[PDB]
Design a protein around this ligand. Sequence first.
Ligand SMILES: [Mg+2]
Ligand SMILES: [Mg+2]
Ligand SMILES: [Mg+2]
Ligand SMILES: [Mg+2]
Ligand SMILES: [Mg+2]
Ligand SMILES: [Mg+2]
Ligand SMILES: [Mg+2]
Ligand SMILES: [Mg+2]
Ligand SMILES: [Mg+2]
Ligand SMILES: [Mg+2]
Ligand SMILES: [Mg+2]
Ligand SMILES: [Mg+2]
Ligand SMILES: [Mg+2]
Ligand SMILES: [Mg+2]
Ligand SMILES: [Mg+2]
Ligand SMILES: [Mg+2]
Ligand SMILES: [Mg+2]
Ligand SMILES: [Mg+2]
Ligand SMILES: [Mg+2]
Ligand SMILES: [Mg+2]
Ligand SMILES: [Mg+2]
Ligand SMILES: [Mg+2]
Ligand SMILES: [Mg+2]
Ligand SMILES: [Mg+2]
Ligand SMILES: [Mg+2]
Ligand SMILES: [Mg+2]
Ligand SMILES: [Mg+2]
Ligand SMILES: [Mg+2]
Ligand SMILES: [Mg+2]
Ligand SMILES: [Mg+2]
Ligand SMILES: [Mg+2]
Ligand SMILES: [Mg+2]
Ligand SMILES: [Mg+2]
Ligand SMILES: [Mg+2]
Ligand SMILES: [Mg+2]
Ligand SMILES: [Mg+2]
Ligand SMILES: [Mg+2]
Ligand SMILES: [Mg+2]
Ligand SMILES: [Mg+2]
Ligand SMILES: [Mg+2]
Ligand SMILES: [Mg+2]
Ligand SMILES: [Mg+2]
Ligand SMILES: [Mg+2]
Ligand SMILES: [Mg+2]
Ligand SMILES: [Mg+2]
Ligand SMILES: [Mg+2]
Ligand SMILES: [Mg+2]
Ligand SMILES: [Mg+2]
Ligand SMILES: [Mg+2]
Ligand SMILES: [Mg+2]
Ligand SMILES: [Mg+2]
Ligand SMILES: [Mg+2]
Ligand SMILES: [Mg+2]
Ligand SMILES: [Mg+2]
Ligand SMILES: [Mg+2]
Ligand SMILES: [Mg+2]
Ligand SMILES: [Mg+2]
Ligand SMILES: [Mg+2]
Ligand SMILES: [Mg+2]
Ligand SMILES: [Mg+2]
Ligand SMILES: [Mg+2]
Ligand SMILES: [Mg+2]
Ligand SMILES: [Mg+2]
Ligand SMILES: [Mg+2]
Ligand SMILES: [Mg+2]
Ligand SMILES: [Mg+2]
Ligand SMILES: [Mg+2]
Lengths: 56, 134, 76
Amino acid sequence: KLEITLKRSLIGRPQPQRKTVQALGLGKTNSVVVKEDNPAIRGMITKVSHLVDVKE
Amino acid sequence: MLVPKRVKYRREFRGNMRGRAKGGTEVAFGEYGLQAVEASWITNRQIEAARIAMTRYMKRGGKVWIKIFPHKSYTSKPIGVRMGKGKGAPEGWVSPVKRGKIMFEIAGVPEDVAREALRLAAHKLPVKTKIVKR
Amino acid sequence: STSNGRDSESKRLGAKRADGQFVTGGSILYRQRGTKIYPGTNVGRGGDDTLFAKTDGVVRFERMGRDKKKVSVYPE
RNA sequence: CUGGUAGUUAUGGCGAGAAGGUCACACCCGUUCCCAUCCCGAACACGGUAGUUAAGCUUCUCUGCGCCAAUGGUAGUUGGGGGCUUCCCCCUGCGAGAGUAGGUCGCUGCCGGG
RNA sequence: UGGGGCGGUCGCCUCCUAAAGAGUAACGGAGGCGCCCAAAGGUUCCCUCAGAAUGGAUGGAAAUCAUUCGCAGAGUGUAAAGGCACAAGGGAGCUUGACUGCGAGACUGACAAGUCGAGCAGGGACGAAAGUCGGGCUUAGUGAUCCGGUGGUUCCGCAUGGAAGGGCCAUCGCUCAACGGAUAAAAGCUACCCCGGGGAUAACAGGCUUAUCUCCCCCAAGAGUCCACAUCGACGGGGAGGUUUGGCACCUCGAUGUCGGCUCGUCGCAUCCUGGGGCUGUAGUCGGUCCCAAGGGUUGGGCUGUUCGCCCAUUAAAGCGGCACG
RNA sequence: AUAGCUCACUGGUCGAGUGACCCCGCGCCGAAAAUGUACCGGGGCUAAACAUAUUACCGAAACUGUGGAUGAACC
RNA sequence: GUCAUGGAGGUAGAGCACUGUUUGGACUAGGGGCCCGGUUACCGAAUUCAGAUAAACUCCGAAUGCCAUGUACUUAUACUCGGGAGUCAGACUGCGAGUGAUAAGAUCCGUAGUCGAAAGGGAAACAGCCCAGACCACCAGUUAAGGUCCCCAAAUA
RNA sequence: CAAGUAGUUAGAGCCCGUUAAUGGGUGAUAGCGUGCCUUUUGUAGAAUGAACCGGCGAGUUACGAUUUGUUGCAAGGUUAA
Ligand SMILES: [Mg+2]
Ligand SMILES: [Mg+2]
Ligand SMILES: [Mg+2]
Ligand SMILES: [Mg+2]
Ligand SMILES: [Mg+2]
Ligand SMILES: [Mg+2]
Ligand SMILES: [Mg+2]
Ligand SMILES: [Mg+2]
Ligand SMILES: [Mg+2]
Ligand SMILES: [Mg+2]
Ligand SMILES: [Mg+2]
Ligand SMILES: [Mg+2]
Ligand SMILES: [Mg+2]
Ligand SMILES: [Mg+2]
Ligand SMILES: [Mg+2]
Ligand SMILES: [Mg+2]
Ligand SMILES: [Mg+2]
Ligand SMILES: [Mg+2]
Ligand SMILES: [Mg+2]
Ligand SMILES: [Mg+2]
Ligand SMILES: [Mg+2]
Ligand SMILES: [Mg+2]
Ligand SMILES: [Mg+2]
Ligand SMILES: [Mg+2]
Ligand SMILES: [Mg+2]
Ligand SMILES: [Mg+2]
Ligand SMILES: [Mg+2]
Ligand SMILES: [Mg+2]
Ligand SMILES: [Mg+2]
Ligand SMILES: [Mg+2]
Ligand SMILES: [Mg+2]
Ligand SMILES: [Mg+2]
Ligand SMILES: [Mg+2]
Ligand SMILES: [Mg+2]
Ligand SMILES: [Mg+2]
Ligand SMILES: [Mg+2]
Ligand SMILES: [Mg+2]
Ligand SMILES: [Mg+2]
Ligand SMILES: [Mg+2]
Ligand SMILES: [Mg+2]
Ligand SMILES: [Mg+2]
Ligand SMILES: [Mg+2]
Ligand SMILES: [Mg+2]
Ligand SMILES: [Mg+2]
Ligand SMILES: [Mg+2]
Ligand SMILES: [Mg+2]
Ligand SMILES: [Mg+2]
Ligand SMILES: [Mg+2]
Ligand SMILES: [Mg+2]
Ligand SMILES: [Mg+2]
Ligand SMILES: [Mg+2]
Ligand SMILES: [Mg+2]
Ligand SMILES: [Mg+2]
Ligand SMILES: [Mg+2]
Ligand SMILES: [Mg+2]
Ligand SMILES: [Mg+2]
Ligand SMILES: [Mg+2]
Ligand SMILES: [Mg+2]
Ligand SMILES: [Mg+2]
Ligand SMILES: [Mg+2]
Ligand SMILES: [Mg+2]
Ligand SMILES: [Mg+2]
Ligand SMILES: [Mg+2]
Ligand SMILES: [Mg+2]
Ligand SMILES: [Mg+2]
Ligand SMILES: [Mg+2]
Ligand SMILES: [Mg+2]
């Protein structure tokens, strides 16, 4: 398991940025979800790593 | 002045001058060179003036190599003409020089006269330069 | 002034089906002038050099010798 | 061992040098016949085995040309952030072209004779 | 349509722009089309180009033969691109598939239209056979409807039988080229002008830009009797200003009055005079050039609407610019 | 031109460093306009500027805390 | 949306194998002269050695983007039919190009953002730049860009 | 002694007493703050309209078409003059 927190806003970000964040399950700012450690999830995270905080 | 004898197309795009020189960074023919430090357009008139200044100082001893040629041509419009109605008419020839390119070489003269001739030539060009050895 | 100014309209050439896609017979796979892609197995060359599937199957863009390509359709 | 017939991006090609055989295949001898030359039995076709491996062919050696090809580095660039913005710099991931180490005088299948 | 006019263009095909799928604009950069072929189409069989070198000739650099090298340096009806030597290139024999009814399924696409197509039936051409043939190596070579003309037709035919007339199938008549074609049929002046609108769009002024313009510098060949730098400074290079000629079309068209003169000034300094200095190719008087300096000063007339400019007579001097050309 | 000074050099006094060249960081000149300082917002600053590193705090209608109103989906 | 796998496509870059442009050297088959065919450099075509250049050059060739397959992991739409519209003057900023002069708050395309239709905090003031999306009330708290000598909340760290 | 889209938030002082409730009037001083409409890429706009107040002043009706909702009957439904 690992913890995902959206710390930066999506205003001013391109569409793939927003679609990836919206597919991760994050809503408003400072929102938290718990996922697993698949290669797909890490592939998402490396794409929007500048908008997010990752924790176990 | 160096001008091509024939051209396939009369009008040409202006291009760009990003990056280092593709080739010619290293002196090969002579043993003294004038290397460009930044990128600029060099016209054939400036090349002729620089060559004349370089040669006159050496008293026509030694040898000179010109490592650039004005392949590209540029156009221009008259005064009082609005925008539109085609492209202008060609006026001159330029050689887009990228940084790191060596454009003049000298051989057959000692340190002092070679360095002074290159210094004299470098003041006719619109680009910052430096002197290199082989 | 401006003796130029004319151009034709684009003919939408290119590839119309992907590698590994199930394809129905008779459907176009590549529109092209001349022969950039040769017809392989179960595909045919048209009048204006298009390639079409002659049977249902799976598209496979394969390679002939050093500098040529071909496309073929394999029943599942 | 050879003749025939396929697959494989030339690592399979080109070039140079040597050897062998009518068992096969060849060159070879002839034009009455089937057939043929904008003329020519050169070729195509037909009919035979006197002679010879000179050539094809087959085998053997090479890097001379060619072809294949790393590792490392560099150019470029998706994403993020800055400058003094003809342009330049930093972080992360991807990563050529040229050059080179090196490889190569092929590798597999089936049928008939010996 | 970088205001309108003058000039040019208006439909179709090929390449670059075009940012490695498709698509993509400009009065952007280059070219072609409004046909041709009775074989330059179909099929069967066969083979191979440009150029160079040497050998002889009338005949030469180049005409026709001979040997060698020769992966395309040729050709492919025609513009370009893509392709093609297992020919799509070149010869010969026979022929007319340059066929009739069609068509699963796709591409393109707002519509109208446009493109490809295996396979089925009828009847054939070439080939021994397998098999190929619904024009040409592939993409231009073309315009709807309405209305008329010609050929065919087991369709209708206004009481019935006919007929006139219509329908259906095949085909013909457009520089309708402003090429999705307003009608079968069409040019100019307006300063005598009028209405509806627009700062969506021009003339003045402002704004952005600084090619041009004014001014200042860098290098230094040279002129200066010698001596580059007292004074000029070629060939080239770098800036500042926002006074010129321009570029753009951001405010103003329910109104921002335009040139010159008069009255009244005020500001900048890149200083015309006066003040203080350095160098001089400064003997003196008079000068040249640069540096600091904006305190005050900076004429009256002839010609022209003139700004400007030339001229007359003076003066210590008769400065250059900004302020909606104050 | 000869002249005057004087170079290369030598002999002495002296007592320890003295030469050019290349690269990088930050600065200097080049640097001029029109109502009034007028190219840090002002005062003012020799750090209250610049470079690298660290730690606290301020700072939005963002997020959270408490109380209300309301839409959709599903129970 | 990401991951794994398979494809089509010649841009950036690079290169000279074709096509144009081009520099130096040796030989140049020659032309003209000084000549008695030599001297040839005054030019020398082909060949070759080396070194350059290209939007309409390519023996090569990425990063991204695109088309699919999946049974992988997340996530909430996609399509068809019908009723009703408005829109067809766009602007600036970053990046890739054309025209222009590699001028313009210029003009015309590709791509992303913001304004248009968006208040709030920072750039003194400031549609388009940086942070960030206002259901209402509170004399509560933590942070973003930007800041902490005084105007002016917070370090004369 | 003051630089003001005239208000709003904080607020002393003075004067009152209500549909009785964390009430009313005025406000020294402090922070923030460039009217309404129209038309626009964009207006506080030096772009348009309005002196102020009151009244009047702009998607309606008839006959057809189509689609949704409701009611009656249903292989039938329904009348017009
Ligand atoms: Mg085209
Ligand atoms: Mg055909
Ligand atoms: Mg055809
Ligand atoms: Mg490599
Ligand atoms: Mg494309
Ligand atoms: Mg693309
Ligand atoms: Mg034409
Ligand atoms: Mg032909
Ligand atoms: Mg042929
Ligand atoms: Mg068929
Ligand atoms: Mg038949
Ligand atoms: Mg048949
Ligand atoms: Mg027969
Ligand atoms: Mg008509
Ligand atoms: Mg009758
Ligand atoms: Mg025409
Ligand atoms: Mg059309
Ligand atoms: Mg008539
Ligand atoms: Mg009027
Ligand atoms: Mg305007
Ligand atoms: Mg006018
Ligand atoms: Mg006027
Ligand atoms: Mg103007
Ligand atoms: Mg004005
Ligand atoms: Mg300027
Ligand atoms: Mg002289
Ligand atoms: Mg000059
Ligand atoms: Mg102007
Ligand atoms: Mg515009
Ligand atoms: Mg006006
Ligand atoms: Mg008015
Ligand atoms: Mg001065
Ligand atoms: Mg003076
Ligand atoms: Mg004086
Ligand atoms: Mg004065
Ligand atoms: Mg008189
Ligand atoms: Mg004045
Ligand atoms: Mg005025
Ligand atoms: Mg005036
Ligand atoms: Mg002043
Ligand atoms: Mg909220
Ligand atoms: Mg709550
Ligand atoms: Mg390139
Ligand atoms: Mg709908
Ligand atoms: Mg339109
Ligand atoms: Mg438009
Ligand atoms: Mg646009
Ligand atoms: Mg550009
Ligand atoms: Mg611009
Ligand atoms: Mg614009
Ligand atoms: Mg939005
Ligand atoms: Mg805002
Ligand atoms: Mg704000
Ligand atoms: Mg500012
Ligand atoms: Mg503010
Ligand atoms: Mg909200
Ligand atoms: Mg805090
Ligand atoms: Mg006072
Ligand atoms: Mg008072
Ligand atoms: Mg009160
Ligand atoms: Mg609008
Ligand atoms: Mg406007
Ligand atoms: Mg006013
Ligand atoms: Mg109006
Ligand atoms: Mg009014
Ligand atoms: Mg109505
Ligand atoms: Mg009912």
